[PDB]
Design a binder for this molecule. Structure first.
Ligand SMILES: Nc1nc2[nH]cnc2c(=O)[nH]1
Ligand SMILES: Nc1nc2[nH]cnc2c(=O)[nH]1
Ligand SMILES: [Zn+2]
Ligand SMILES: [Zn+2]
Lengths: 358, 358
């Protein structure tokens, strides 16, 4: 099994479909990664996460380092073992969640619940992460200083990873592009990332509230800046329509808490758009969540029952909603993969859109 | 398939083991019924409830009648259909939960979140319950008046059930014995119940705080009062040791929220007694919840992980704890069944006890 081998099987415009082969499994691209925050994809057994078609999950470095602790997890045999998921895991570096969730310096970030690039890579090493993210940071003058520090930290991240042989031979390292919405800075960052060399390139700084029109505009010049021959990862995105539009602009990988979080809150994704299952209109609706969905929830239970469950605050409500929503997301990615491979993605996106917003 | 056929395959002292055959399935006795409060066994899919070995679950008439409503559930195809459990369901009558959970009369009980024997049977009819409980009520003088009203209500329950042909031919009706801790009243009640005739006889009024020594003393004279040839159901009991002692005194059926509720709260049952998984002693314990347990949780996850889950308030923590605890309970009942069939129950109970309290 290769450490990390990205092969593009087909293209359509800027869209790509293909595979990443890793020691613990194959990742089909474009890929959606369910987020497994505290060593769990909320309300799902890992076998269920797999059943939905996920090839890889996301774990959080910030959260695990506090609870239960990275050295504790290593002692316990590593994150794969601990949570019972034996496939690839991508771990975020902690960067984003240290700012928005809790004393900054060139050395790193100090905080309250001393993370640096080196320590970040070490914690991810300890968790036994398959895809390690470089440690990074959150106006033009300011965008460049944040972006410039991150590129320094990416070089630090690179060397720390390379210094750990066990990591170098079995894991992969991704660079994160910053630069806010400025093409010039974005360019700078890709140039610096490319000169360091990484297995994959993320687009950071766009899961921020900017809106889709502006996110797409930034992806429009940003992704062509990245090495074509490596996977392109859009962090923290997104809604089904965000995903389709991002793939149309060259993104191969995605993660988002939307399908899980939303599910627990009553929101179910369908090919005709999201529904809120708690609405009284579903109280006697015997139809499944979505009438095309292949997941186990839609084979077995009605909207009416899941309506009842969620209104009553029952745990099974969250389990069912979450399984469906992750399944939906995986089915979307499969439809994306098949349509690019068949040279009909552009039509798929148009048809998708017409029905989903309708 | 018979409507209701109880066959005793073997006996040891007052203990019995055997089967109840019903249209929707066979019930192995002594049986433990997971409680499925609001049309769900909390944090478990019904396929999982089945996997643990449960043959029958308990649903609550009081709760369902308020949410989502019995006529609504009937319109939706019935409780089996609605929650996706296709095996027997016993529904409690609402009696117990109307008192302790929220204007009394010979007619019935009026309350705030007009239930009578007739309405109770009608609601259970609407839910499509396989085992219907008769409608009943919560000092000697007073015990007899409560007990005496209940026996009147049991006669009303009998006729209401018999008046519904669809119910009479496909469901079963159980009588509930009351009388508090007095042998004389207990006797009275069995005599009245027996004279009406029921498919099964419950012992009500002992899930009350009286303590095990006193509960066992009451079961000591109470169960021999009931028709030998019908199943004997102890409502709302109990801990593993309560169950063993009750079987030793003639009880064939049990329900309790203990394994589910306790599981969500961090308490796991083991053959060496209950543990509280949240205790710091388990933080790095790689052993399963119980080192003999055959359930799927104990095959896959460590105490340490489930410790982490429950401390973090994660939904998967509740799912895993609950699956294990219900599995444990079913394994206990299987051990009980096998030991009576083999004529070594008395020794089983002694060995069980030595280890569990140890
Ligand atoms: N590390 C990191 N994580 C993210 N998640 C969403 N956006 C980002 C980002 O820019 N950096
Ligand atoms: N209906 C009813 N339910 C119970 N659950 C526990 N005890 C009782 C009882 O005495 N009657
Ligand atoms: Zn579905
Ligand atoms: Zn177990």
């Amino acid at each position: 099994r290769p450490r990390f081998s990205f092969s593009i099987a087909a293209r359509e415009g800027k869209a790509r479909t293909g595979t990443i082969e890793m020691k613990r499994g194959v990742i089909r691209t474009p890929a959606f990664m369910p987020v497994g925050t505290a060593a769990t994809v909320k309300a799902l057994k890992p076998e269920t996460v797999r059943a939905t078609g996920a090839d890889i999950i996301l774990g959080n470095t910030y959260h695990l380092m506090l609870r239960p602790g990275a050295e504790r997890i290593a002692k316990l045999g590593g994150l794969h073992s601990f949570m019972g998921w034996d496939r690839p895991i991508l771990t975020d570096s902690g960067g984003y969640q240290v700012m928005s969730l809790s004393k900054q310096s060139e050395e790193g970030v100090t905080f309250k619940s001393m993370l640096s690039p080196e320590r970040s890579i070490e914690i991810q090493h300890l968790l036994g992460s398959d895809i390690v993210m470089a440690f990074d940071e959150c106006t033009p003058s300011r965008a460049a200083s944040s972006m410039e520090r991150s590129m320094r930290w990416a070089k630090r991240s690179r060397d720390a990873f390379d210094s750990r042989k066990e990591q170098a031979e079995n894991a992969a390292l991704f660079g994160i592009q910053q630069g806010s919405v400025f093409e010039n800075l974005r360019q700078q960052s890709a140039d610096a990332l490319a000169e360091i060399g990484f297995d994959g390139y993320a687009v950071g700084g766009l899961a921020v509230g900017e809106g889709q029109d502006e996110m797409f505009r930034v992806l429009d010049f940003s992704v062509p800046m990245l090495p074509d021959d490596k996977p392109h990862y859009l962090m923290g995105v997104g809604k089904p329509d965000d995903i389709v539009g991002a793939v149309e602009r060259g993104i191969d990988m995605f993660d988002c808490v939307l399908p899980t979080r939303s599910g627990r809150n009553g929101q179910a994704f369908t090919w005709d758009g999201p529904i809120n299952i708690r609405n009284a209109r579903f109280s006697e609706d015997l139809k499944p969540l979505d009438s095309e969905c292949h997941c186990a929830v839609c084979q077995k239970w009605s909207r009416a029952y899941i309506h009842h469950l969620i209104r009553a605050g029952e745990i099974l409500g969250a389990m069912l909603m979450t399984e469906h929503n992750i399944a939906f997301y995986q089915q979307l990615m499969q439809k994306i993969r098949d349509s690019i491979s068949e040279g009909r993605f552009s039509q798929f996106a148009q048809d998708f859109r017409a029905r989903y917003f309708a």
